Structure formats: C-alpha cells, structure tokens
Design a protein around this ligand. Structure first.
Ligand SMILES: Nc1ccc(C(=O)O)c(O)c1
Length: 121
C-alpha cells in the first residue's frame, strides 16, 4: 500500500515520503509524462512502470508484509499481487537510497508543464 511504501521510504532514506517524494520531478507521486529530471525521478519512473506491469493489482491499497534481514528488505509471501507490489516498492526505496546523493529540493512541487513527452517503459 501507499502508506507502507511511505514507511519503507522513510526507513531507507530518513526523508518523509510526503513531502520529499510525493511531488518530485515528473514521475514521483503523480507520474505520467516527460523526461525524468534526475536519478531520483527515474526511480519513480521505473516504479510507475513496475506498477504498470500489474494492471489487475491495486498497489495504492493492497497491503504486503516485509521484514529486514541485516538492513535488507525481504518481501514476505502474500498473494501474487502483494508479492509483486512489494518487489516494486522495495526496488524504488533502494533506488531512492542509492540516489540520495543527487536528490535536489528544486524538484519538489515540480510543475506539470515542464514534463512533456512520452517515455516508454
Ligand atoms: N549514488 C550512487 C550512484 C551509483 C551507484 C552505483 O553502484 O552505480 C551507487 O551505489 C550510488
């Protein structure tokens, strides 16, 4: 679920999902169009694609379980949708962590009209 994803994001990065990743660039929080602005935004682009791979799942609301082994996220077995959603979220949280070094506050609340063009998954 979105709330679980947000908790995972905070755990990984020390930033609150809202507002650090809920309106960032062209793809974080509200996706759609444009060339992703930076690596963090590309995390969101891929995450959006990842959810797009699951048209008959409901990642906003469906809850999954995960645990930590060391610092590593391990998705626990639920329904197939839950497993796949968890893997998408895990990847995005790791991706955010991997790209914290280039995160830029100037991309928060990034205006829609600067996000133009389709980019295929
Ligand atoms: N910020 C970054 C960028 C690249 C890598 C990488 O392994 O290529 C990383 O571990 C962190």
């Amino acid at each position: 679920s979105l709330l679980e994803f947000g908790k995972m994001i905070l755990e990984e990065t020390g930033k609150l999902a809202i507002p650090s990743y809920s309106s960032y660039g062209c793809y974080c929080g509200w996706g759609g169009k444009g060339t992703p602005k930076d690596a963090t935004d590309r995390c969101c682009f891929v995450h959006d694609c990842c959810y797009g791979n699951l048209p008959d799942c409901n990642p906003k609301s469906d809850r999954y379980k995960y645990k930590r082994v060391n610092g590593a996220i391990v998705c626990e077995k639920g329904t197939s949708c839950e497993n796949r959603i968890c893997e998408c979220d895990k990847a995005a949280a790791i991706c955010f962590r991997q790209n914290l070094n280039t995160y830029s506050k100037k991309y928060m609340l990034y205006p829609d009209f600067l996000c133009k063009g389709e980019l295929k998954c």
